[PDB]
Design a protein around this ligand. Structure first.
Ligand SMILES: CC(C)(C)NC[C@H](O)COc1cccc2c1CC(C#N)=N2
Ligand SMILES: CCCCCCCCS[C@@H]1O[C@H](CO)[C@@H](O)[C@H](O)[C@H]1O
Ligand SMILES: CCCCCCCCS[C@@H]1O[C@H](CO)[C@@H](O)[C@H](O)[C@H]1O
Length: 288
């Protein structure tokens, strides 16, 4: 592992940036990929794209140099963007979970109402809600603390630690993560028990094949979500324990799970290779 993880980090920017750009272009070419569900996937990709383009590069100069070299302002701005992307992602994963549920339960009402021009409004909203609950409180300094040590970090332009009061710490992590998480999980468990009773004896390859595509594609969504959890959940669990006893967890561990979450921005394009369409579409653009 000390090899794979060591290699992983030198290409993360690449694997994220190139991996996600490869996904947005794959769908922008094949209109057979141009569906409703794949529009939310593009949102997800834009999030991850920003991560590897802004979040990770600056996170790298900080970790490597062991100091912030960009100034007090960009520090806050970088922090904002970082928080915005994670919230937007977990919310979009909710929308997707709910979308697939309403397309499984109310098919008719789904087709006459859910249009391509409307899924775009739904996406602009999720970026709007995330900008509110993530970007604004940081701008109004609702995050800050009063501890001498905390105040010490704010006077230093070279310090970019997210030292926050225990009120904010708990509120922001519940709003951004745990709520959409619990919602996405709950809804995702529902969509599964629905997809199980569908394929649960007397139908030709007319109904079997159409349910063979809409089950292999659903299984991928469940992975995108399950993976997203395994990556970020640790960071947020530790972020809560820090509130109870601030000296219980080492700082290197705090930075450990945070880069684990960043890895999720490169994993998506990879999992999308469970589909022939994407797989072929990738090899298309890669001049194979
Ligand atoms: C180096 C930094 C600190 C930039 N990493 C931030 C992390 O990626 C994301 O942290 C958060 C994401 C969403 C919601 C959050 C959150 C931290 C808190 C708190 N209280 N609420
Ligand atoms: C889209 C802009 C995102 C900024 C995110 C970090 C905000 C830090 S507080 C912010 O700092 C600015 C510069 O000092 C002031 O001019 C503002 O009044 C104040 O609210
Ligand atoms: C995303 C929303 C996070 C809300 C966090 C809980 C509400 C208080 S935050 C913070 O508490 C400080 C001490 O009470 C006050 O001095 C500040 O003015 C205030 O901003």
């Amino acid at each position: 592992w000390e090899a794979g993880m060591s290699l992983l980090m030198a290409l993360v920017v690449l694997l994220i940036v190139a991996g996600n750009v490869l996904v947005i272009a794959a769908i922008g070419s094949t209109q057979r990929l141009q569906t409703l569900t794949n529009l939310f996937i593009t949102s997800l990709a834009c999030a991850d794209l920003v991560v590897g383009l802004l979040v990770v590069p600056f996170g790298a100069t900080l970790v490597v140099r062991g100091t912030w070299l960009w100034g007090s302002f960009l520090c806050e701005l970088w922090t904002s963007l970082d928080v915005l992307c994670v919230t937007a992602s977990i919310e979009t994963l909710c929308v997707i979970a709910i979308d697939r549920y309403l397309a499984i339960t109310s098919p008719f009402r789904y087709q006459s109402l859910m249009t391509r021009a409307r899924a775009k409004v739904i996406i602009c909203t999720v970026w709007a809600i995330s900008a509110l609950v993530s970007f604004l409180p940081i701008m109004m300094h609702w995050w800050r603390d009063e501890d001498p040590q905390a105040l010490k970090c704010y006077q230093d332009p070279g310090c970019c630690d997210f030292v926050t009061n225990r009120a904010y710490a708990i509120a922001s992590s519940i709003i951004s993560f745990y709520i959409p998480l619990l919602i996405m999980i709950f809804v995702a468990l529902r969509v599964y028990r629905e997809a199980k009773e569908q394929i649960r004896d007397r139908a030709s390859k007319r109904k079997r094949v159409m349910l063979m595509r809409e089950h292999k594609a659903l299984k991928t969504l469940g992975i995108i979500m399950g993976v997203f959890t395994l990556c970020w959940l640790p960071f947020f669990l530790v972020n809560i324990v820090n509130v109870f006893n601030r000296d219980l967890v080492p700082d290197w561990l705090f930075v450990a799970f945070n880069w684990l979450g960043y890895a999720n921005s490169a994993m998506n394009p990879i999992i999308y290779c469970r589909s022939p369409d994407f797989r072929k579409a990738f090899k298309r653009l890669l001049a194979f």
